[PDB]
């Protein structure tokens, strides 16, 4: 019985493209989309830097997955909560590579 | 995209982790100039699966406290942002090296 841990992500951002409803035969259907968040930070005129971070979002939960596929659109502003999962997988070599996603379990439509 | 592409419109990129440190922290330099403290953090889900996070500490002061006080087996709460650390490996393949850039660390053990 392992002790309690936490793996909790909160994002609020704009969706990068229309979601993909993905059923790679075997694993159950998943709604996939991307979420952009911007980080602004200072560095004549006021010199300020900006970086856009592109998150891959997966929705497995059965009711939320369908709501996500039908209502998330390109440009949609949303808030979401989930956990980070790195998607380890063996490639053609004898080691592992990562495919990081945020597994959303809660989505709030802000638009 | 312009200089007028200010994107004052705000967003949120926030992660909270509570778990156990996998190994003693190490110290690296990124590009030629930015010292960083790096360690691993394990979190678990009931469902089982141990999820292994790469933690990077860039903040000055925090990075030194982390390096001196985080130890293998330390229990840690931390907060920060996700950076996916995309790069090109040896063979032009685009890889991810996802890290949580911690801006707050609370020591529990």
């Amino acid at each position: 019985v392992l002790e309690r841990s936490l793996n909790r992500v909160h994002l609020l951002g704009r969706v990068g493209q229309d979601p993909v409803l993905r059923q790679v035969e075997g694993k159950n259907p998943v709604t996939i989309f991307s979420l952009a968040t911007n980080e602004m930070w200072r560095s004549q005129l006021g010199d300020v830097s900006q970086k856009t971070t592109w998150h891959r979002i997966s929705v497995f939960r059965p009711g939320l997955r369908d709501v996500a596929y039908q209502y998330v659109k390109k440009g949609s502003r949303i808030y979401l909560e989930g956990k980070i999962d790195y998607g380890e997988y063996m490639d053609k070599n004898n080691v592992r590579r990562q495919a990081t996603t945020i597994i959303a379990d809660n989505i709030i439509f802000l638009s | 995209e312009t200089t007028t592409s200010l994107v004052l419109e705000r967003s949120l990129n926030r992660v909270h982790l509570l778990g156990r440190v996998g190994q003693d922290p190490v110290l690296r330099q990124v590009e030629g100039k930015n010292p960083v403290t790096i360690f691993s953090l394990a979190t678990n889900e009931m469902w089982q699966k141990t999820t292994w996070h790469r933690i990077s500490v860039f903040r000055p002061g925090l990075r030194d406290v982390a390096y001196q006080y985080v130890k293998k087996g330390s229990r840690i709460y931390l907060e920060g942002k996700i950076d996916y650390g995309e790069y090109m490996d040896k063979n032009n393949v685009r890889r991810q090296a996802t890290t949580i850039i911690a801006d707050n660390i609370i020591f529990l053990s």
Binding site: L45, D47, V48, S49, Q50, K51, T52 | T3
Partner: peptide, 4 residues
């Protein structure tokens, strides 16, 4: 202005 700076954009990564």
């Amino acid at each position: 202005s700076s954009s990564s």
